[PDB]
Amino acid sequence: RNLSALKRHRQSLKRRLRNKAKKSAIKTLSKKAIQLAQEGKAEEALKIMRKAESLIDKAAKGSTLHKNAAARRKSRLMRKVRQLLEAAGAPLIGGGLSA
Amino acid sequence: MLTDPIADMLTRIRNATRVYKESTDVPASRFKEEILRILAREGFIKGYERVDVDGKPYLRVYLKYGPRRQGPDPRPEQVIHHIRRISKPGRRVYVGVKEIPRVRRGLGIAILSTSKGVLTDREARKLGVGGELICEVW
Amino acid sequence: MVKIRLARFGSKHNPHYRIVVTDARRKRDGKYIEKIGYYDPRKTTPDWLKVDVERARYWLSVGAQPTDTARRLLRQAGVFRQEA
Amino acid sequence: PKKVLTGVVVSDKMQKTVTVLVERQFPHPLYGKVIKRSKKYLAHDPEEKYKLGDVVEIIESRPISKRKRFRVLRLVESGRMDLVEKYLIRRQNYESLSKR
Amino acid sequence: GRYIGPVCRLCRREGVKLYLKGERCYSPKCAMERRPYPPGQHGQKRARRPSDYAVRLREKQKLRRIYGISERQFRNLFEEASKKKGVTGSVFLGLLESRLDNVVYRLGFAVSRRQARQLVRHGHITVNGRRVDLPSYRVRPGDEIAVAEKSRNLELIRQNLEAMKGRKVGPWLSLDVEGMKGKFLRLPDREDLALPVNEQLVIEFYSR
Amino acid sequence: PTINQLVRKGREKVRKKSKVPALKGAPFRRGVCTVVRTVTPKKPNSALRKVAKVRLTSGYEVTAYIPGEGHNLQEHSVVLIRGGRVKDLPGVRYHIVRGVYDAAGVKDRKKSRSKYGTKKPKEAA
RNA sequence: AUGUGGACCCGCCCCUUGGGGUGUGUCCAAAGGGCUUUGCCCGCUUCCGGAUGGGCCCGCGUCCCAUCAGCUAGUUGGUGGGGUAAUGGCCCACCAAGGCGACGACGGGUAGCCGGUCUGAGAGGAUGGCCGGCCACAGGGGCACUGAGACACGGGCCCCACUCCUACGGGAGGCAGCAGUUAGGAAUCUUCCGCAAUGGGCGCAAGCCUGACGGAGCGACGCCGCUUGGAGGAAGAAGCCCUUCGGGGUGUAAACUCCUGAACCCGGGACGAAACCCCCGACGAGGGGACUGACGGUACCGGGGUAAUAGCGCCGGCCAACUCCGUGCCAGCAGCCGCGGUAAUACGGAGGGCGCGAGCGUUACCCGGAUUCACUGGGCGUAAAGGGCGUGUAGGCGGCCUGGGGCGUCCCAUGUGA
Ligand SMILES: [Mg+2]
Ligand SMILES: [Mg+2]
Ligand SMILES: [Mg+2]
Ligand SMILES: [Mg+2]
Ligand SMILES: [Mg+2]
Ligand SMILES: [Mg+2]
Ligand SMILES: [Mg+2]
Ligand SMILES: [Mg+2]
Ligand SMILES: [Mg+2]
Ligand SMILES: [Mg+2]
Ligand SMILES: [Mg+2]
Ligand SMILES: [Mg+2]
Ligand SMILES: [Mg+2]
Ligand SMILES: [Mg+2]
Ligand SMILES: [Mg+2]
Ligand SMILES: [Mg+2]
Ligand SMILES: [Mg+2]
Ligand SMILES: [Mg+2]
Ligand SMILES: [Mg+2]
Ligand SMILES: [Mg+2]
Ligand SMILES: [Mg+2]
Ligand SMILES: [Mg+2]
Ligand SMILES: [Mg+2]
Ligand SMILES: [Mg+2]
Ligand SMILES: [Mg+2]
Numbered sequence A: 001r002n003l004s005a006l007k008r009h010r011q012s013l014k015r016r017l018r019n020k021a022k023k024s025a026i027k028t029l030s031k032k033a034i035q036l037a038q039e040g041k042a043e044e045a046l047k048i049m050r051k052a053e054s055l056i057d058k059a060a061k062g063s064t065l066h067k068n069a070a071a072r073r074k075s076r077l078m079r080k081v082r083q084l085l086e087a088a089g090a091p092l093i094g095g096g097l098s099a
Numbered sequence B: 001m002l003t004d005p006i007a008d009m010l011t012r013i014r015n016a017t018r019v020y021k022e023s024t025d026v027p028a029s030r031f032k033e034e035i036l037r038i039l040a041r042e043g044f045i046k047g048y049e050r051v052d053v054d055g056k057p058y059l060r061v062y063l064k065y066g067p068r069r070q071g072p073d074p075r076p077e078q079v080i081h082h083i084r085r086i087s088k089p090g091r092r093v094y095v096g097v098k099e100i101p102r103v104r105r106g107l108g109i110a111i112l113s114t115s116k117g118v119l120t121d122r123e124a125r126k127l128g129v130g131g132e133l134i135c136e137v138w
Numbered sequence C: 001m002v003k004i005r006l007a008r009f010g011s012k013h014n015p016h017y018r019i020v021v022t023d024a025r026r027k028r029d030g031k032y033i034e035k036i037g038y039y040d041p042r043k044t045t046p047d048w049l050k051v052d053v054e055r056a057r058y059w060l061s062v063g064a065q066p067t068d069t070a071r072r073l074l075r076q077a078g079v080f081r082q083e084a
Numbered sequence D: 001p002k003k004v005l006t007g008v009v010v011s012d013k014m015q016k017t018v019t020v021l022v023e024r025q026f027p028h029p030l031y032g033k034v035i036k037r038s039k040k041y042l043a044h045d046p047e048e049k050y051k052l053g054d055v056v057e058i059i060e061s062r063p064i065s066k067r068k069r070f071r072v073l074r075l076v077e078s079g080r081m082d083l084v085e086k087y088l089i090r091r092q093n094y095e096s097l098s099k100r
Numbered sequence E: 001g002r003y004i005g006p007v008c009r010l011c012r013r014e015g016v017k018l019y020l021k022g023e024r025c026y027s028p029k030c031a032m033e034r035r036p037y038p039p040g041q042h043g044q045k046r047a048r049r050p051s052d053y054a055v056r057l058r059e060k061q062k063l064r065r066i067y068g069i070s071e072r073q074f075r076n077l078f079e080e081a082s083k084k085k086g087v088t089g090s091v092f093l094g095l096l097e098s099r100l101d102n103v104v105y106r107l108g109f110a111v112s113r114r115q116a117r118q119l120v121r122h123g124h125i126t127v128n129g130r131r132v133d134l135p136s137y138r139v140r141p142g143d144e145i146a147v148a149e150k151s152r153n154l155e156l157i158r159q160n161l162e163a164m165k166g167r168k169v170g171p172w173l174s175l176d177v178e179g180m181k182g183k184f185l186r187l188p189d190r191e192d193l194a195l196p197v198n199e200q201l202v203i204e205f206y207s208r
Numbered sequence F: 001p002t003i004n005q006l007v008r009k010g011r012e013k014v015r016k017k018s019k020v021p022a023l024k025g026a027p028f029r030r031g032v033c034t035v036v037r038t039v040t041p042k043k044p045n046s047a048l049r050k051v052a053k054v055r056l057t058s059g060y061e062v063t064a065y066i067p068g069e070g071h072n073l074q075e076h077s078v079v080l081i082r083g084g085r086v087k088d089l090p091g092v093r094y095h096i097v098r099g100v101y102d103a104a105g106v107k108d109r110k111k112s113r114s115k116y117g118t119k120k121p122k123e124a125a
Numbered sequence G: 001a002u003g004u005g006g007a008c009c010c011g012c013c014c015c016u017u018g019g020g021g022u023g024u025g026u027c028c029a030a031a032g033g034g035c036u037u038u039g040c041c042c043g044c045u046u047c048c049g050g051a052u053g054g055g056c057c058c059g060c061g062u063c064c065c066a067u068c069a070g071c072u073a074g075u076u077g078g079u080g081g082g083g084u085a086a087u088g089g090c091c092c093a094c095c096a097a098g099g100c101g102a103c104g105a106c107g108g109g110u111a112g113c114c115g116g117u118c119u120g121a122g123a124g125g126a127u128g129g130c131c132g133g134c135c136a137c138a139g140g141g142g143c144a145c146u147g148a149g150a151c152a153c154g155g156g157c158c159c160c161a162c163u164c165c166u167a168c169g170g171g172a173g174g175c176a177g178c179a180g181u182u183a184g185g186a187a188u189c190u191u192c193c194g195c196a197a198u199g200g201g202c203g204c205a206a207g208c209c210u211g212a213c214g215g216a217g218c219g220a221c222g223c224c225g226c227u228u229g230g231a232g233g234a235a236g237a238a239g240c241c242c243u244u245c246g247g248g249g250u251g252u253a254a255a256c257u258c259c260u261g262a263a264c265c266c267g268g269g270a271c272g273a274a275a276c277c278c279c280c281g282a283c284g285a286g287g288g289g290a291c292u293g294a295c296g297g298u299a300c301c302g303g304g305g306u307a308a309u310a311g312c313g314c315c316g317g318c319c320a321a322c323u324c325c326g327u328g329c330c331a332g333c334a335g336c337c338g339c340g341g342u343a344a345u346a347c348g349g350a351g352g353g354c355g356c357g358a359g360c361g362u363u364a365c366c367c368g369g370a371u372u373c374a375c376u377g378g379g380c381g382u383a384a385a386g387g388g389c390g391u392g393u394a395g396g397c398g399g400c401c402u403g404g405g406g407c408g409u410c411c412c413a414u415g416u417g418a
């Protein structure tokens, strides 16, 4: 009394539970850098920010994030961290920043 | 007050011919003459001399009339049977070279002001222009 | 992708396909991108076919896609002969 | 081309924004009488320089905000609070038409 | 379909010979040389001044009743004719004569229009060598109208063609009596054929 | 009126009142009879015209004329409305179609049978 | 891991609204499967272009009621964020108090819009049904997921209503898809055939699905073509009508005599089909070969072959067509004017005539006539119509000459108007 393409949904769940979990990470992880770059720790932060940059740009191998999305993320990310550390902090590792 | 000078002249004429007279005047105007300039060259009238009325410059306009008919009402036929204003100040009428009139299947004339001076139903089509359609006469 | 196919015209029991370029997601008798000739699978006319090769191959240079049956005509129309 | 219009300013009570009042003459489609119209736009003025009476110009632009898709071009003749008069009266008189 | 029944009565309703019969409507009368007055109980009674309408109605029926064609097909032509430019009135009869069943009557293949229909209908008529059983068929310049082989006989055809000797054809036609072939040379202007019908009155009747 | 006035006011479009509303716009309307009587007509005329008060679908109830000579319409008779007034009978702008539902055509009708819902009779045998 | 390249931060360069480029830092990739395999093919991966399809925004145009005259708190602008492919007050904080409306806001009512369509001399008026473009919806609402793209008819979750199965111990469903049923209604169809053709998806390809589509089915619903026959045939039968009883009409109409002979009978029988595919040439080009028809043995062709459905409206005037009888303001007709009272061309029947013809009438609705909303193209002393009279706001309108500008206006050119 149906079609077998009900798969698509039956699949679409995995993809959902897949890039949902992938994304909950980016959020909590994009936080680390924010919190740190807010409080001096330029060194330890500018390694989470490189990572963040990873998970973000890495994500662009699927149907999770795409287009100017990862670009808009960083654009606001590795611009927000530089402003925070700008207040005191003093740079430590450009590992991700063409200062 | 004169909310419309052109019309005033046309009517100034219309009211004279109806009673048959040799000439009626009318306040001077650069634009007013270029209009009479058409009627002379089209023979709708005789001519006119920039006469003067008490310091004020007028335009003695001279009228033509048909031959003195006979029988009841010996009054002659009109050279200018009909004349009425088209593009009024309360409503301007603008037409292109393709939207030009057609007075009495040629038997009449139409006067319009264009970017190439004061022309005729014809000249407008010949020149290939168009502008404010002043009036019609026949 | 954009395709080149037949579009029924004329009437019932009387085809007069229009050959044209349009998106594959349009109805076969829908709004096409550019008309480039016709065809009468009945052979009841001297002009039972016609193509604008100059305009046809152009869509091929931009990456068109003819039907398996639209090929036939296109090939049997003298548009594929590479030549040299 | 990006639409370009000439209008005057009547408002600047918005942080960074001014209101420009435009006009356009065109014949009536049925009666042919040359008539006027009007349309108030919300002009974007970042460096709030222009004030009231400024007969200025504007250009079609990307969406600044809801209701605000017009940047200012140039001045055309400031110091014309006379046009802002007849506009101010109109809205002024709208308190005399009240069905009350 | 087409009209069927009393026709000599029409011959005399309009008050004019129209030769819808073969010999009779052509012999001593369409029943009229006997009684040249209108049918019905009120025949031998004086008439009332026919109104401008009734005149155009009568002058129309006349023409249509002549070619014996329904009001359907009929007006369709006038409109098609009227659609054109020039005179239409003249153009009208042009489209009337172009009918197949008409050409046959003229080309003497048949005596009456109603006989000419039976011919075309049954398939005993040709056109450039085609079986054309459609009386509605419109003919143009140079079209050849002959008889089919299965029919190039029949004791009725020879009679009709034979009678056609000692008679001429329109300035827009040409018959090979001895061969059973004819040709439509051109569209016959108003002149090319005179008739009891003032077209101009038929034009008026259609601008109600 | 000056042309200026016309740009202000504009020429108002007439509009037209329907003479047959009970119909709801369609050509006909199925209904049901309530009272069947005869009423003295109006004007210079005189008689006893056969009419019917009809309860129809659209919760309406209007008076309807019964054409011809003699009908078979009782109280709970079904019927169909036509449209078109009588005149002599003020306040009745609808005729009844014959030979439909509970309205039988006029018997022994030989002339205009299209109306009166009478079928073609037999000639000889 | 690799990075041709791409992504983002900063400086720099050009351009200049986040466009291109540069430098530096950091981040980012992959997929194999089948073989006339050892070389091709079917795919994978990142990038810069092409093409196609979109999203968003803007100018102008887009009905009725002012007997709806004032509307607004995310409301208007700002700042900064969140958000998306990205602009945006889209969303969220805070700042300021703005934003809209007689050029008709807000409100109620009606409506999917256009190409077109109908009418009209025209301008206009009316309309948006089939076909085509766009929008919106998929039992009523809300929502998000997947994905390049949906907030998704035949996908999912939740609420609601409705309905169905049940060993009731519990679950199911969404025809505004094709047909069909039911109710509503004046009323609108086959529960058909076929994937042969065309189009679509999947695939290397055979091949597969395709109520898209090609067809067939039902309905004079429409337009169109066609038939119920043709010639001859009387001073013109019978019958039925009138009649001044002399006669007139139906009427060549029939009969009748010849002629053909639609339908039906027999045989034949399609165009619609050619490719994909296969062989040769390398699967390129080319050439050659082969396959497949639903409609259906149907259209059409031959020959045989029978005179074979005619109905409807009207005949007072407008408006074409007249008499008898019946009836007697009764029964009845009627678009309007009006017909019927014992002589009715107006009711009812008959005879006859006019008008159409597989149609003829009726009702309803749109335009026309109506120039009767009048732009084209009208009026206001007495026919409907000058405000009871001023003052004045906005608004409309504006005198003679000359110059700048050239908005309106006008010409040319070009794009678009599928
Ligand atoms: Mg990848
Ligand atoms: Mg997604
Ligand atoms: Mg599409
Ligand atoms: Mg091929
Ligand atoms: Mg003409
Ligand atoms: Mg007419
Ligand atoms: Mg840049
Ligand atoms: Mg790998
Ligand atoms: Mg395998
Ligand atoms: Mg869309
Ligand atoms: Mg923002
Ligand atoms: Mg999205
Ligand atoms: Mg925003
Ligand atoms: Mg922003
Ligand atoms: Mg807020
Ligand atoms: Mg007011
Ligand atoms: Mg406005
Ligand atoms: Mg209004
Ligand atoms: Mg509403
Ligand atoms: Mg609606
Ligand atoms: Mg339209
Ligand atoms: Mg049309
Ligand atoms: Mg017309
Ligand atoms: Mg029009
Ligand atoms: Mg509309």
Ligand SMILES: [Mg+2]
Residues within 6 Å of the ligand: none
């Ligand atoms: Mg529909």
Ligand SMILES: [Mg+2]
Residues within 6 Å of the ligand: none
């Ligand atoms: Mg549609």
Ligand SMILES: [Mg+2]
Residues within 6 Å of the ligand: G139
């Ligand atoms: Mg439903």
Ligand SMILES: [Mg+2]
Residues within 6 Å of the ligand: G053, G149
């Ligand atoms: Mg799309």
Ligand SMILES: [Mg+2]
Residues within 6 Å of the ligand: G152, G153
């Ligand atoms: Mg779906």
Ligand SMILES: [Mg+2]
Residues within 6 Å of the ligand: G152
């Ligand atoms: Mg859904």
Ligand SMILES: [Mg+2]
Residues within 6 Å of the ligand: none
């Ligand atoms: Mg949707």
Ligand SMILES: [Mg+2]
Residues within 6 Å of the ligand: G153, G154, G175, G177
């Ligand atoms: Mg469904």
Ligand SMILES: [Mg+2]
Residues within 6 Å of the ligand: none
């Ligand atoms: Mg079901």
Ligand SMILES: [Mg+2]
Residues within 6 Å of the ligand: none
């Ligand atoms: Mg259905």
Ligand SMILES: [Mg+2]
Residues within 6 Å of the ligand: none
């Ligand atoms: Mg059904």
Ligand SMILES: [Mg+2]
Residues within 6 Å of the ligand: none
């Ligand atoms: Mg029912």
Ligand SMILES: [Mg+2]
Residues within 6 Å of the ligand: none
């Ligand atoms: Mg169907």
Ligand SMILES: [Mg+2]
Residues within 6 Å of the ligand: G195
């Ligand atoms: Mg198929």
Ligand SMILES: [Mg+2]
Residues within 6 Å of the ligand: none
């Ligand atoms: Mg296929």
Ligand SMILES: [Mg+2]
Residues within 6 Å of the ligand: G203, G205
């Ligand atoms: Mg394949």
